[PDB]
Amino acid sequence: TFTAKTGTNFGNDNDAEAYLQFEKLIDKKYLKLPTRVNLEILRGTKIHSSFLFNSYSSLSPQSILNLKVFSQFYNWNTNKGLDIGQRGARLSLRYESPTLFHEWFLETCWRSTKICSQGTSAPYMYSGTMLSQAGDQLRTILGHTFVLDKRDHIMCPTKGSMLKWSNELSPGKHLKTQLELNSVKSWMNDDFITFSTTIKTGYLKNLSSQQSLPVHICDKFQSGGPSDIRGFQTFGLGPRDLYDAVGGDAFVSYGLSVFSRLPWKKVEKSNFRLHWFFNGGKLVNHDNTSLGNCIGQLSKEHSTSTGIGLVLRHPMARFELNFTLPITAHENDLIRKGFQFGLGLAFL
Amino acid sequence: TFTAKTGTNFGNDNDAEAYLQFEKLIDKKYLKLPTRVNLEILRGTKIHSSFLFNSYSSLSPQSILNLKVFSQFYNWNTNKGLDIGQRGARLSLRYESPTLFHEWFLETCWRSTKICSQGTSAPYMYSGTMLSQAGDQLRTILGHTFVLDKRDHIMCPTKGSMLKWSNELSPGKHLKTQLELNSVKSWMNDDFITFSTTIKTGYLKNLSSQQSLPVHICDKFQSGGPSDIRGFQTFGLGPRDLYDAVGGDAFVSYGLSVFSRLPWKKVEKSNFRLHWFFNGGKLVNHDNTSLGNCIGQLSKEHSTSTGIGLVLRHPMARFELNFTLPITAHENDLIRKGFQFGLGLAFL
Amino acid sequence: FDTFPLQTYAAQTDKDEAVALEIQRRSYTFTELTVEGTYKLGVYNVFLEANTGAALATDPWCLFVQLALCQKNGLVLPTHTCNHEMLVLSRLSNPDEALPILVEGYKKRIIRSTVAISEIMRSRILDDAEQLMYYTLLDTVLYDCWITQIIFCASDAQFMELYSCQKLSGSIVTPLDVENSLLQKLSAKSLKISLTKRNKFQFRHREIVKSMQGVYHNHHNSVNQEQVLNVLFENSKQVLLGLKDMLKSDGQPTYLHLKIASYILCITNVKEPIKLKTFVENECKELVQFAQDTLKNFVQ
Amino acid sequence: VKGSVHLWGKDGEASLISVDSIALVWFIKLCTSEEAKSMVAGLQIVFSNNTDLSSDGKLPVLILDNGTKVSGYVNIVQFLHKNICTSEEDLAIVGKKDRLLEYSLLNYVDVEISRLTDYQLFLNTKNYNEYTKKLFSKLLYFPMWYNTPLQLRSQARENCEEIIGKIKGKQELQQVKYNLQFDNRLQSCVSNWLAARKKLDDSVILSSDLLFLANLYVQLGLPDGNRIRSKLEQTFGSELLNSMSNKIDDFVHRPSNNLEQRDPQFREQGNVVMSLYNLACKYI
């Protein structure tokens, strides 16, 4: 009924947010629907401060409103990078064994953008693109997210597929579309050899009146990292201005992985698997005229990598210790070959 | 028998202390005494990396050996501060309703000390004292710790006292002595008004041959903070070189607190108490000649504070939301008046 | 083994065209070589000089460095092939949060901040001690009046016209303009707070900067705030009435003559009747004429 | 002009934590000519010792009996030179042809040289504990003995952060470094002021003279004042440092007959009552 709790949500680049959450299950004489407020204080190496009020409220047997009022400061694009002020509200309606849910939201957000790169480090975050991303902006964004997770485990999958289709419309500014598929197959009687494909594609159209009002660097697509195409640093792929990953307006990022259960007699009941993968993808700044020239550059010049490793699959995390070599790369990519620790929840 | 567990343990100054621990209760055909190994991986905002092997082994009905092999990197003295490399071993023997235990240990430790303060911030961590603390050192330290916790709760105390007396001898280098008392009294039939006194005193003698071999900054006494004398920042009291708390060789830190059960009809079964406190103390760099001149400067020029607040007492944490004003302060102290969030387990 | 990237590609030279359209509508290129030898001056905003027709920066420090860059290199001011352009930036393009910066070079790219530029500008007049006295007086007394007249006496629309890189249309007609006028209400205070940390304004005027941080505007502060602003203004008139007796250049304009001219050109750009604008237009007509005679050294 | 001037000292002597209040006792002392007295006749000086009567929180304040508070030495003096009705042996009034160089020299000491004296009274550890912390016990009232200088070294470390920022052998390596960052800063600021002071007149004391001399009176009069006097003699010679100390010795050995003072009443003094009330009006 109060339940002050703790934990870690395990962030984008091997990173981790330590959080502290309060809660109150509310009686039925302010409301009549089951309401569940929250208050999250988050802590991390990237986060400066993060307050996150929540208000979940079951409208139906299959309906959950979620008024999320947030005010978060966090750092971004790690060499020294940018720290993002981000405050606003978000009213999300989520609608409903294959897991199936739609989730429409609506989010107002005043967003600040410091370049905290401390210019003694000379050419980093001081390109012409990043110098124009600095400043304040206010943005309403409409959204939709459909998930058709048919897998039998979102922890240690063995069968099933997945389909994550998330559209985001900032009216008059941009329209972000993103697709994500997954497919897990197994071939032996112990679920021994686990084949796993992941393909993620996305498109970002500028709906802004003769190509004014550019899309912010935090909304563009980024590629590379351990929770992405392994073998490169985070924000390591795509086009650059000077040395800064300025993101792309369209991308594809495929993946293949085999898990082989660590064939020793004592330890073959555990979550340790032998991991060979093959990742790769492309991140382009398209011209907004044709979907045919968007696909045309999205299949010509890819940055791929394979690599052998070991993977542990815990409840809240998937620990990956890969040795990775990039087969094919672009020129201006940020290579991370050799050993690489992977940690998080979303790998592709 | 394996029991992989994890945590986060929120502290004070916004950290994380994220830990993940493995375990193995060992059968009786490597040993004959009940042995219980561990392996702790810790991450936090302060911790860079922290591996901590443990080996508990019950020798008797009242005896526990503890071979603790550690290798930890963590940051210290937060403005930017120092990051401490710290690796070694620790063999501790712990000997045995009033809680009573002695605990003698013996710890070898090679300790590194970077000044990571990144000198663009000009006068911080770059005093003459901190510039000489940088470097490597190896140190054996013998120890002893006696606890006579007579309280009925170390979670929500209402009666009883406590006595924590911990000596540490680095042979030929220093001798650290530290005392800590506690006294909880209650006056009403609901355990309503909870009087609570805490007094902590300590002494650090330099046993090192005509005052060579100075005591390291991580072994000196520090004062101030929310888990200490409230109303000041952490490492906010004591003498300074430029602006850096260079610690003290002797201290006293008293405390007084009242808890008043939040007199509302519905909520008077909870852990929310109304907290008025009065903290204060002194931190000196004594001369090693007399214990009379050590006490003489330890009672003349104190930095005290009172303040009203609200306190929640959870199982693993005590959440404190105080409004604090410093009554008496030194000149070079780091004042934190106004609102202050308190979080942790050890308050005084 | 350092041979393992088997195919090493080209550098993926496709760029976002909408981003380079705002690096073009914020750049004001200085008319008279390479790409590693040309710098980009960052400014808060820009205004069209009504008499001459030149893009001048709206801040007296951003305009003074702009005129000092024209004199040092023999440039012409931009009208409102790798030249020395100006650049309307945000304060948040810095950890310092103070915009008169210099983005020098392309590959080996040096950033000289406002504290770093002020040391360069002050060191060129350290030879004459008397000219350093006046230069410190405009940087302290005349500066602190201008900052208080524009943060407290001018409205939110007049501060954000001069000190914000946000866009303006004038008329609320579209739903984009409602949202753009809620940025000018939300983010007005944070740009004011950031401006008070530029010339140690936060250290000379610690108690009126402290009242800017607070909500609901405690009533005892506002009576004391009018006392400091009136003392700063009556000091500023004695500066401005004393400047008129030495505006005689025997050659190129000195770094003090560009310093005076950058204050008169930005005070007379204020559309609202602040007391500095009413003073320099009615009582200091000899200063307004001087601030156009020195502007005509850097135009065509 | 009719009003009451509030200062920092006690019992007719201005406090040495303020180079401005020492200069303002010397200002009214040397206002003896007919034009110089008419702007100061009507000023009852108060050693009130509370900054809650200020508009800046800074206590050389001129309150003017109509709600007009002018705070600081440079703001008060330029306010007093302005309110002359206008119908050499002492402080002389600067003519209109030189009113800008006198305000530029007054402003230079206030932002460049008086910054360096707040380094010496507050950020010098020898000079602080041996002299300066022994002062606020006598000036202020009993519970507010400690919070008031607590901000005054925060305010001194922020103001001087850009210029001067086996353990005992490294602590001397940092203090020799910071005695060179100061003595290259003080060598330049005094040379810049003295090369511009020669333009006005090398015969007549002025208002900017009394702020530079009161900065030399505090810096040479502190416990660490003997090596600063030794380093100023190394570059400026011995004739100028004695000539600028003979003028200092004149202004402290000056009779206070022109100075008509008063005790601070019970809306002044910063009591327990008269600072809990100024805390309530500041919030309510």
CSV table of N, CA, C and O in Angstrom, one decimal, chain C residues 191-237:
chain,number,residue,atom,x,y,z
C,191,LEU,N,17.0,32.0,-19.4
C,191,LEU,CA,17.9,32.8,-20.1
C,191,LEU,C,18.4,34.1,-19.4
C,191,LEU,O,19.5,34.6,-19.6
C,192,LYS,N,17.5,34.6,-18.6
C,192,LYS,CA,17.8,35.7,-17.7
C,192,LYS,C,18.9,35.3,-16.7
C,192,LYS,O,19.8,36.0,-16.4
C,193,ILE,N,18.7,34.1,-16.0
C,193,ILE,CA,19.5,33.6,-15.0
C,193,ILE,C,20.9,33.3,-15.6
C,193,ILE,O,21.9,33.6,-14.9
C,194,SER,N,21.0,32.8,-16.8
C,194,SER,CA,22.2,32.5,-17.4
C,194,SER,C,23.0,33.7,-17.9
C,194,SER,O,24.2,33.6,-18.0
C,195,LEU,N,22.3,34.8,-18.1
C,195,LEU,CA,23.0,36.1,-18.5
C,195,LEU,C,23.7,36.7,-17.4
C,195,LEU,O,24.7,37.4,-17.6
C,196,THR,N,23.2,36.5,-16.1
C,196,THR,CA,23.8,37.2,-15.0
C,196,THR,C,25.1,36.5,-14.5
C,196,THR,O,25.6,36.9,-13.4
C,197,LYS,N,25.6,35.5,-15.2
C,197,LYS,CA,26.9,34.8,-14.9
C,197,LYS,C,28.0,35.1,-15.9
C,197,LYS,O,28.9,34.3,-16.1
C,198,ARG,N,27.9,36.3,-16.6
C,198,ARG,CA,28.8,36.5,-17.7
C,198,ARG,C,30.0,37.4,-17.4
C,198,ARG,O,31.1,37.0,-17.7
C,199,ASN,N,29.8,38.5,-16.8
C,199,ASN,CA,30.8,39.4,-16.5
C,199,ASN,C,31.0,39.6,-14.9
C,199,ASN,O,31.2,40.6,-14.4
C,200,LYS,N,30.8,38.4,-14.2
C,200,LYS,CA,30.7,38.4,-12.8
C,200,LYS,C,29.6,39.3,-12.3
C,200,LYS,O,29.7,40.0,-11.3
C,201,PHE,N,28.5,39.3,-13.0
C,201,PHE,CA,27.3,40.0,-12.6
C,201,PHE,C,26.7,39.4,-11.3
C,201,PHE,O,26.2,40.1,-10.4
C,202,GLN,N,26.8,38.1,-11.2
C,202,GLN,CA,26.3,37.3,-10.1
C,202,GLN,C,27.1,37.6,-8.8
C,202,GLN,O,26.7,37.3,-7.7
C,203,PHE,N,28.3,38.2,-8.9
C,203,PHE,CA,29.2,38.5,-7.8
C,203,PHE,C,29.2,39.9,-7.4
C,203,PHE,O,29.6,40.2,-6.3
C,204,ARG,N,28.9,40.8,-8.3
C,204,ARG,CA,28.8,42.2,-8.0
C,204,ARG,C,27.4,42.6,-7.5
C,204,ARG,O,27.2,43.6,-6.8
C,205,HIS,N,26.4,41.8,-7.8
C,205,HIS,CA,25.0,42.1,-7.6
C,205,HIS,C,24.3,40.8,-7.0
C,205,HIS,O,23.2,40.4,-7.5
C,206,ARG,N,24.9,40.2,-6.0
C,206,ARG,CA,24.5,38.9,-5.5
C,206,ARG,C,23.1,38.8,-5.0
C,206,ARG,O,22.5,37.8,-4.9
C,207,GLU,N,22.5,40.0,-4.5
C,207,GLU,CA,21.2,39.9,-3.9
C,207,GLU,C,20.0,40.1,-4.8
C,207,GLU,O,18.9,39.7,-4.5
C,208,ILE,N,20.2,40.7,-6.0
C,208,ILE,CA,19.2,40.8,-7.0
C,208,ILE,C,19.2,39.6,-7.9
C,208,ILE,O,18.2,39.2,-8.5
C,209,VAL,N,20.4,38.9,-8.1
C,209,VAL,CA,20.4,37.7,-8.8
C,209,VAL,C,19.8,36.6,-7.9
C,209,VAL,O,19.2,35.7,-8.4
C,210,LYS,N,19.9,36.7,-6.6
C,210,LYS,CA,19.3,35.7,-5.7
C,210,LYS,C,17.8,35.8,-5.7
C,210,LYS,O,17.1,34.8,-5.5
C,211,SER,N,17.3,37.0,-5.9
C,211,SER,CA,15.8,37.1,-6.0
C,211,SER,C,15.3,36.7,-7.3
C,211,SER,O,14.1,36.4,-7.4
C,212,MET,N,16.1,36.5,-8.3
C,212,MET,CA,15.7,36.0,-9.6
C,212,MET,C,15.5,34.5,-9.5
C,212,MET,O,14.6,33.9,-10.2
C,213,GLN,N,16.2,33.8,-8.6
C,213,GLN,CA,16.1,32.4,-8.5
C,213,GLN,C,14.8,32.0,-7.8
C,213,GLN,O,14.3,30.9,-8.0
C,214,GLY,N,14.2,32.9,-7.0
C,214,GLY,CA,13.1,32.6,-6.2
C,214,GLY,C,11.7,32.8,-6.8
C,214,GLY,O,11.6,33.6,-7.7
C,215,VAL,N,10.7,32.0,-6.4
C,215,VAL,CA,9.4,32.1,-6.9
C,215,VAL,C,8.6,33.1,-6.0
C,215,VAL,O,9.0,33.3,-4.9
C,216,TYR,N,7.6,33.7,-6.6
C,216,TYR,CA,6.5,34.5,-6.0
C,216,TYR,C,7.0,35.9,-5.7
C,216,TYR,O,6.2,36.8,-5.3
C,217,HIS,N,8.3,36.2,-5.8
C,217,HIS,CA,9.0,37.5,-5.8
C,217,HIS,C,8.6,38.3,-4.5
C,217,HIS,O,7.8,39.2,-4.5
C,218,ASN,N,9.3,37.8,-3.4
C,218,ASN,CA,9.2,38.4,-2.1
C,218,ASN,C,9.2,39.9,-2.0
C,218,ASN,O,10.1,40.5,-2.7
C,219,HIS,N,8.3,40.5,-1.3
C,219,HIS,CA,7.9,41.9,-1.5
C,219,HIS,C,9.0,42.9,-1.0
C,219,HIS,O,9.1,44.0,-1.5
C,220,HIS,N,9.7,42.5,0.0
C,220,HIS,CA,10.8,43.3,0.5
C,220,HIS,C,12.0,43.4,-0.4
C,220,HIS,O,12.7,44.5,-0.5
C,221,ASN,N,12.2,42.4,-1.3
C,221,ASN,CA,13.2,42.4,-2.2
C,221,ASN,C,13.0,43.4,-3.3
C,221,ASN,O,13.9,44.1,-3.8
C,222,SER,N,11.7,43.6,-3.7
C,222,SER,CA,11.4,44.4,-4.9
C,222,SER,C,11.6,45.9,-4.6
C,222,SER,O,11.8,46.7,-5.5
C,223,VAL,N,11.4,46.3,-3.3
C,223,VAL,CA,11.7,47.7,-3.0
C,223,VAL,C,13.2,48.0,-2.9
C,223,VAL,O,13.7,49.0,-3.4
C,224,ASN,N,14.0,47.0,-2.4
C,224,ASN,CA,15.4,47.1,-2.4
C,224,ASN,C,16.0,47.0,-3.8
C,224,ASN,O,17.1,47.5,-4.1
C,225,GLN,N,15.3,46.2,-4.7
C,225,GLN,CA,15.8,46.0,-6.1
C,225,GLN,C,15.7,47.3,-6.9
C,225,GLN,O,16.5,47.6,-7.7
C,226,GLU,N,14.6,48.1,-6.6
C,226,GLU,CA,14.5,49.4,-7.2
C,226,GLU,C,15.5,50.4,-6.8
C,226,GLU,O,15.8,51.4,-7.5
C,227,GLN,N,16.1,50.2,-5.6
C,227,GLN,CA,17.2,51.1,-5.1
C,227,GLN,C,18.5,50.9,-5.8
C,227,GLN,O,19.2,51.8,-6.2
C,228,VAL,N,18.8,49.6,-6.1
C,228,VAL,CA,20.1,49.3,-6.8
C,228,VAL,C,20.0,49.6,-8.2
C,228,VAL,O,21.0,50.1,-8.8
C,229,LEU,N,18.8,49.5,-8.8
C,229,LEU,CA,18.6,49.8,-10.2
C,229,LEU,C,18.6,51.3,-10.5
C,229,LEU,O,19.1,51.8,-11.5
C,230,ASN,N,18.1,52.1,-9.5
C,230,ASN,CA,18.2,53.6,-9.6
C,230,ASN,C,19.6,54.1,-9.4
C,230,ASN,O,20.0,55.1,-10.0
C,231,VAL,N,20.3,53.4,-8.5
C,231,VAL,CA,21.7,53.8,-8.3
C,231,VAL,C,22.6,53.4,-9.5
C,231,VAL,O,23.5,54.2,-9.9
C,232,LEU,N,22.3,52.3,-10.1
C,232,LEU,CA,23.0,51.8,-11.3
C,232,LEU,C,22.7,52.7,-12.5
C,232,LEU,O,23.5,52.9,-13.3
C,233,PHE,N,21.5,53.3,-12.5
C,233,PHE,CA,21.1,54.1,-13.7
C,233,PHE,C,21.6,55.5,-13.5
C,233,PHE,O,22.1,56.1,-14.5
C,234,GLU,N,21.6,56.1,-12.3
C,234,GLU,CA,22.2,57.4,-12.1
C,234,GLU,C,23.7,57.4,-12.2
C,234,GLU,O,24.3,58.4,-12.5
C,235,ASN,N,24.3,56.3,-11.9
C,235,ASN,CA,25.7,56.1,-12.2
C,235,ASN,C,26.0,56.1,-13.7
C,235,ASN,O,26.9,56.6,-14.2
C,236,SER,N,25.0,55.4,-14.4
C,236,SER,CA,25.2,55.2,-15.9
C,236,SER,C,25.0,56.5,-16.6
C,236,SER,O,25.6,56.6,-17.7
C,237,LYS,N,24.2,57.4,-16.1
C,237,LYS,CA,24.1,58.7,-16.8
C,237,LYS,C,25.4,59.5,-16.6
C,237,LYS,O,25.8,60.2,-17.6
